[PDB]
Amino acid sequence: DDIIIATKNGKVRGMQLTVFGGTVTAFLGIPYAQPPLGRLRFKKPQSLTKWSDIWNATKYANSCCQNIDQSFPGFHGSEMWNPNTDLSEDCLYLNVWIPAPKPKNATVLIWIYGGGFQTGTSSLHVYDGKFLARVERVIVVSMNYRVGALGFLALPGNPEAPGNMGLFDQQLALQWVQKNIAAFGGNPKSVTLFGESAGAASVSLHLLSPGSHSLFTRAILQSGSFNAPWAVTSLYEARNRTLNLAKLTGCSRENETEIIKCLRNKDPQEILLNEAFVVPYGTPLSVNFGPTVDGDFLTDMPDILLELGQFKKTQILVGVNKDEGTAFLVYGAPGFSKDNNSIITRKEFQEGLKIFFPGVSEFGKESILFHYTDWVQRPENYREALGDVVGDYNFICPALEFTKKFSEWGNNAFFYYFEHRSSKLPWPEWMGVMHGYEIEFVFGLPLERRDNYTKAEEILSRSIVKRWANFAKYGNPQETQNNSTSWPVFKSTEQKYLTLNTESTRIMTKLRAQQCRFWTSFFPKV
Amino acid sequence: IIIATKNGKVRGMQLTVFGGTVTAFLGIPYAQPPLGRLRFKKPQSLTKWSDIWNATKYANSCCQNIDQSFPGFHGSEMWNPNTDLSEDCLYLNVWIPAPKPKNATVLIWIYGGGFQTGTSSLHVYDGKFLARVERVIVVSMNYRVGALGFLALPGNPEAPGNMGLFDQQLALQWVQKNIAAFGGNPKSVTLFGESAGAASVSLHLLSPGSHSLFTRAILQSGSFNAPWAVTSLYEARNRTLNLAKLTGCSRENETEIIKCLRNKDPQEILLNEAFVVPYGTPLSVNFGPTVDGDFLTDMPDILLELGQFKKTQILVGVNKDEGTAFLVYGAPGFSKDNNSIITRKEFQEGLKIFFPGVSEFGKESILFHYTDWVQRPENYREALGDVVGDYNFICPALEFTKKFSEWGNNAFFYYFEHRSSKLPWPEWMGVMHGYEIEFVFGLPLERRDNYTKAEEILSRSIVKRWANFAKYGNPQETQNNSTSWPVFKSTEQKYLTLNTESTRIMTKLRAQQCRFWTSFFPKV
Amino acid sequence: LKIFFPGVSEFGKESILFHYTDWVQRPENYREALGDVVGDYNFICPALEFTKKFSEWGNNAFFYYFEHRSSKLPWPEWMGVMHGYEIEFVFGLPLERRDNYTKAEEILSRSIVKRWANFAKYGNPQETQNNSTSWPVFKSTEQKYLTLNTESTRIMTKLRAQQCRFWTSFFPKV
Numbered sequence A: 001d002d003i004i005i006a007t008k009n010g011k012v013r014g015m016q017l018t019v020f021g022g023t024v025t026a027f028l029g030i031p032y033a034q035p036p037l038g039r040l041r042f043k044k045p046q047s048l049t050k051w052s053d054i055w056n057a058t059k060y061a062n063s064c065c066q067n068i069d070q071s072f073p074g075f076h077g078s079e080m081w082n083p084n085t086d087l088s089e090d091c092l093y094l095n096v097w098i099p100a101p102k103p104k105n106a107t108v109l110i111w112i113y114g115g116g117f118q119t120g121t122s123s124l125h126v127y128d129g130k131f132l133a134r135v136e137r138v139i140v141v142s143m144n145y146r147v148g149a150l151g152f153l154a155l156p157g158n159p160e161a162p163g164n165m166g167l168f169d170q171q172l173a174l175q176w177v178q179k180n181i182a183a184f185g186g187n188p189k190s191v192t193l194f195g196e197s198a199g200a201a202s203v204s205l206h207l208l209s210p211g212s213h214s215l216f217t218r219a220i221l222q223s224g225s226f227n228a229p230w231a232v233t234s235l236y237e238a239r240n241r242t243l244n245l246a247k248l249t250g251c252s253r254e255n256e257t258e259i260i261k262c263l264r265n266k267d268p269q270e271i272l273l274n275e276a277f278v279v280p281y282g283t284p285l286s287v288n289f290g291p292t293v294d295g296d297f298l299t300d301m302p303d304i305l306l307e308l309g310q311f312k313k314t315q316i317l318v319g320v321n322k323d324e325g326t327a328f329l330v331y332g333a334p335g336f337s338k339d340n341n342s343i344i345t346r347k348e349f350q351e352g353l354k355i356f357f358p359g360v361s362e363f364g365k366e367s368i369l370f371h372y373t374d375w376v377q378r379p380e381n382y383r384e385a386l387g388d389v390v391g392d393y394n395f396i397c398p399a400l401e402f403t404k405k406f407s408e409w410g411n412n413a414f415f416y417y418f419e420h421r422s423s424k425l426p427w428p429e430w431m432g433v434m435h436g437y438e439i440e441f442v443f444g445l446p447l448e449r450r451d452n453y454t455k456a457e458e459i460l461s462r463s464i465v466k467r468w469a470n471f472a473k474y475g476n477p478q479e480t481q482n483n484s485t486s487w488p489v490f491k492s493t494e495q496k497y498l499t500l501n502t503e504s505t506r507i508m509t510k511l512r513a514q515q516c517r518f519w520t521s522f523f524p525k526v
Numbered sequence B: 001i002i003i004a005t006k007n008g009k010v011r012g013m014q015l016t017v018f019g020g021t022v023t024a025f026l027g028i029p030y031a032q033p034p035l036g037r038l039r040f041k042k043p044q045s046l047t048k049w050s051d052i053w054n055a056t057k058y059a060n061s062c063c064q065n066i067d068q069s070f071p072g073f074h075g076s077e078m079w080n081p082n083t084d085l086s087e088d089c090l091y092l093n094v095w096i097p098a099p100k101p102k103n104a105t106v107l108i109w110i111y112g113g114g115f116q117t118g119t120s121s122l123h124v125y126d127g128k129f130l131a132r133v134e135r136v137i138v139v140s141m142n143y144r145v146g147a148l149g150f151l152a153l154p155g156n157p158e159a160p161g162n163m164g165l166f167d168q169q170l171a172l173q174w175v176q177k178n179i180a181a182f183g184g185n186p187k188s189v190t191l192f193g194e195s196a197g198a199a200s201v202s203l204h205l206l207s208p209g210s211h212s213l214f215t216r217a218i219l220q221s222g223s224f225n226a227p228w229a230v231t232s233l234y235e236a237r238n239r240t241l242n243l244a245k246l247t248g249c250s251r252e253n254e255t256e257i258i259k260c261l262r263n264k265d266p267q268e269i270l271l272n273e274a275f276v277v278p279y280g281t282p283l284s285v286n287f288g289p290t291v292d293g294d295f296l297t298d299m300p301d302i303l304l305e306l307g308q309f310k311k312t313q314i315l316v317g318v319n320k321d322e323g324t325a326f327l328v329y330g331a332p333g334f335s336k337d338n339n340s341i342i343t344r345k346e347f348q349e350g351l352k353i354f355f356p357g358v359s360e361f362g363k364e365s366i367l368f369h370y371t372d373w374v375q376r377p378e379n380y381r382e383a384l385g386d387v388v389g390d391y392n393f394i395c396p397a398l399e400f401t402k403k404f405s406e407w408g409n410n411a412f413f414y415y416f417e418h419r420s421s422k423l424p425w426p427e428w429m430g431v432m433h434g435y436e437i438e439f440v441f442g443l444p445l446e447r448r449d450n451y452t453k454a455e456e457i458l459s460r461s462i463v464k465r466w467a468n469f470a471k472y473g474n475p476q477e478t479q480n481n482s483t484s485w486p487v488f489k490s491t492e493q494k495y496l497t498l499n500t501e502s503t504r505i506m507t508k509l510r511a512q513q514c515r516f517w518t519s520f521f522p523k524v
Numbered sequence C: 001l002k003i004f005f006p007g008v009s010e011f012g013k014e015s016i017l018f019h020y021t022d023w024v025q026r027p028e029n030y031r032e033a034l035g036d037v038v039g040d041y042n043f044i045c046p047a048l049e050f051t052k053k054f055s056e057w058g059n060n061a062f063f064y065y066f067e068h069r070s071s072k073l074p075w076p077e078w079m080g081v082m083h084g085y086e087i088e089f090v091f092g093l094p095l096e097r098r099d100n101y102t103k104a105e106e107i108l109s110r111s112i113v114k115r116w117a118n119f120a121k122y123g124n125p126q127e128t129q130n131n132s133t134s135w136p137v138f139k140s141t142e143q144k145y146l147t148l149n150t151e152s153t154r155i156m157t158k159l160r161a162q163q164c165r166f167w168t169s170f171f172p173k174v
Ligand SMILES: *[C@@H]1O[C@H](CO[C@@H]2O[C@@H](C)[C@@H](O)[C@@H](O)[C@@H]2O)[C@@H](O[C@@H]2O[C@H](CO)[C@@H](O)[C@H](O)[C@H]2NC(C)=O)[C@H](O)[C@H]1NC(C)=O
Pocket: A237, A240, A241, A244, A245, A247, A248, A277, A278, A279, A280
């Protein structure tokens, strides 16, 4: 041991790891599709022709091409999200963590990484399945999927650049688990997708894709949903951007297919560079190349499918963090530094609004100003206001609204409001419970003793881990043993959600009702 | 400015309030000084006086001891009486807004202080603001406390018990017969009180004698069903006798013991009061309300249990940290000066202080239920606070509301959780017992006063909600886009949180803990 | 108590003492008390609680409280309707004439045998022919159960509600 699994594609060697005085077998870097190179760039992921021999699956594989956030070189806070393996066009691999001893029929969890469809990789320390396998005895799988232009370049209906390639990657990863996980003792019949930010959005898209209906069982959505403003691109911009990219690399043409031929020949880095520029103005949140209505993976605008109950029927767990917005302020909002406590002026608030809502009518920005700056004298007012604006508009509202409309079609849905600030959080107090900073608690990182999270925090993680685990296994996110708070189903009438924190978890109603009325009812009209 | 009361005339006095006038009638007598031969008796009718009564200074507070743990400290002293103690103290105040209103809803205040202490003249009970801002009439009275008010010799008309309660009731009758002359509407009367004040309010709901003397009720941190609020007919006696012995008043003819005591000096009585029990607690209400078969016609838990009370709306609520205030009067480790971190050993010690008579097992359960930690230094400090909070205030409070609403009435419940920034006690005591009263009487509305803007708003809101509750039986603030305050049903048990940030609607206040106090503890 | 709850905190054993020895003077008090303690804690409560939680997921469940002492019971009166001493009535042993169970007892067994048989066959433990008591479904709300004995079988609610609260809610915490 020496431990080999016989996948319907070939053999793969794992590697034992120690976890809290236990063994977990890790299979890192298994290829699930055929490297999408040269002639395959911009295409749907291709079948894997069975390899002969043993695949040594003992190091994370190459992350996919992407730009790297370099606002704060050396800063953990920002860098912990940067890829930690070689960027490459060759990146369609996935990881599996089965607990040891090999389990009989384990529920499988599949992770999908966030990062605006532009950045991300499964190999991040915060996405380490090894703990979940150890503690809740499930199999955890994660995959890498193409991002930015390379994964979502869209030339509508044109099979050369049909769009949503990254999404199809994910899907092929699901098929893989479908055909193989049993060999590791996984139960293909009990599969729960979960992701965060674009990850969550992807999870939600899978609920809508018929292609995915049967590739999984349940779904968890952490800070994100397709109906978020940043998540889907109109078939119009999709084109404008594909063309803009073409111009920007001297690839303009007559035969459309030729433009793809052209681009198929540029250097990854030359593409990665211009991506930033295919829109007139951008935001800290610009998702330049994302999912589109391709009439393949997505068969119609998804708000319509959601609206009219056209999606997998099953339970869902959904939730957000107390301060989704803050993380972004520091990438362009005048007055905001990660270093000063970023008190800003009314004048600057107006300024911040211009940054996050570039194309929005002057009236539109006025309404936002008006709704959020109706003060309850206090210095931080405008600072926090702009936070919530971004928070509420990009994450918390579309999140809530998805949950709402989904449960209307008769399914159980649970909602959480995560409101705990890791005490090891490298960013400043004021950014509060930040976007993406619950992931570590979900993957159970605080369970690691020599790690310096607090006792409070170890407990919390242990609880969440269980709730999630349970939700995966039985479609019910209860913690039944340590006298916990019962987590109520989210009905479209009363709209209850559970708060997650180290003190007391409480049951509450109608999260951000006031604000989301504005974002949901009024603002789409300006 | 003269009013023609069915007893005589009384001169008011104009006062300036937020660029407005309010007429104050301080010190109106409502009964006949209970002196010598009247000591320990039900309050006596007022023989109409001839002439004008100048009602322009607060009257004498009633006899009582004075908290002297912290001489010079505002925190404790602000509650001490601010007028001469006297056996002659049955007077009451009215604050009508100016101009004299037509049919104003009236609010009657009842002061707390364990039935042992208190007086209407306290700065924090100043009705002048409420009259000004919500255009209601505010009345408050003084009632006998301690032995002098509640000395009980069951069924013996010489010391029939609950005298102070009857005082209060006579004050109600007074408003009943007179408030119209000040443009009060006797038909729309809301009682409100706090601590023993609240408990009195609740007792009034049970007294048939009071059924018709008022309309609605508000109960702030307190309810008769609280452990400290009613005395068994047995202790009532043991204590009346103990007091007799302690002043050489023991006897054969019972009436003679009253004769004896009727002759000792107020101070001599006040002194021994502290001692009529074997051991005491910071919360000992030595001479309180009892089942007198007059004011209370049967044990009140039974009356509450079987829906024998005035049917009407009620507003009930408590503060985040009811317990802390008392820790500093005997709990080993607790000072108002150090941040009072204490040890497991000391916690056990604290328990002995607050539950003297309780079985060794009984104290163990308490230890067990509250010290099941979630490593943190303050644990035991906070635990002991909650224990006192939950047991003496928060649970009986909740349980009252619950049982009361079962009989088909609208009830609203609040959890007041804001710490006045002008709070003289230390941070750790948090939102303390009795420190919402100021926000109710709208003290933060006073600009030159240094409460925060946050705080002015809050008070403005409460004042309105209360005011509204008094007027229409509904504690809503309908105009400033406020949170709707849901009715408290026995099923879902929703309450409204009151604070400067966001007021929220929540369920099942302290469900875990009160199960223990309500279901388990009465059995140990 | 020390014998049956060896590892249990001193407090824990105190609670048990306290809950069960709140007498209604009678000599057997403590004897019966300790019986019920073991009865309630090891059998009757976990039994009831299982039934409860199981029926919550929408299934029909029936509950019986067997309260007849075989007249051929080799143990002493005081041990009463003992653990395991309904088995013989379920397998119909009293149906054997030359066996010296009473007539009362033959009937009873015949009834149980039928109810069981029926329950096996049709998922309903009724005895439909001899004008019997209908055996109600056990709902998590009203918690009805049927008593089994030679005199009259009755329908009752909330078996040992008082005690099982203690065993189910409180005791797992000590
Ligand atoms: C679609 O794209 C056009 C062109 O975008 C420009 O050229 C690209 C190659 C890239 O370099 C971008 O940065 C450029 O902006 C957009 O037209 C531009 O944007 C606005 C028009 O609203 C205008 O201020 C610019 O001057 C235009 N650029 C030029 C020089 O033509 C346009 O925004 C997009 N179309 C829509 C309506 O989405």
